[PDB]
Amino acid sequence: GSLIRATNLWGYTDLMRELGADPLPFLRRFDIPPGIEHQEDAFMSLAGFVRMLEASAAELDCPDFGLRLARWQGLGILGPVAVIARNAATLFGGLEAIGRYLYVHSPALTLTVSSTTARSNVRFGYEVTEPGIPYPLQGYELSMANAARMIRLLGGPQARARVFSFRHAQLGTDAAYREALGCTVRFGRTWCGFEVDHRLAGRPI
């Protein structure tokens, strides 16, 4: 089964404490080694991680767990891939490099970057594909909240996607998604990701 860089766990101990919960029983349940959060270049089970997110959200009545966890994460979780992204010429170049090398983060993640004459914007379409996992709802929300942070870092603190799209129906509060994503959010769609206009895409880093 696929690994993911264990930077994707940054904040889990802190958030779990914020919610009044002991993280250690969760880590052991999902076969995640307890210190791995803080071990650079370590990798963890992607299946374990996504199931742990779902259990943390469900058992703690925290529907926006994934969105909240992104507050401790952002571009730095991409480790070597962040170094490549920051050295691109334009925000597009940065995000497309992330897409090209996203397998370095986890082989289970696919980013499709496309634009078409027939439609507005550059679309960043994102998929988690891992045999045997439940639909990684919290995983997708964490991914997109991270993406929004990455847009602001690479694109300047005013930079926003035009839209975020999720396959699932809205779970958390309106306020939760607005705070994390900071734009139109569409739910229950055929694709997951975000779009950026060409003006922002071509902005120098």
Ligand SMILES: O=C(CCC(F)(F)F)N1CCC(c2ccc(F)cc2)CC1
């Ligand atoms: O937070 C995660 C993964 C969380 C997990 F594993 F649960 F899915 N990720 C951070 C954001 C990243 C990304 C970067 C640029 C894009 F345009 C789209 C996505 C995917 C991995």
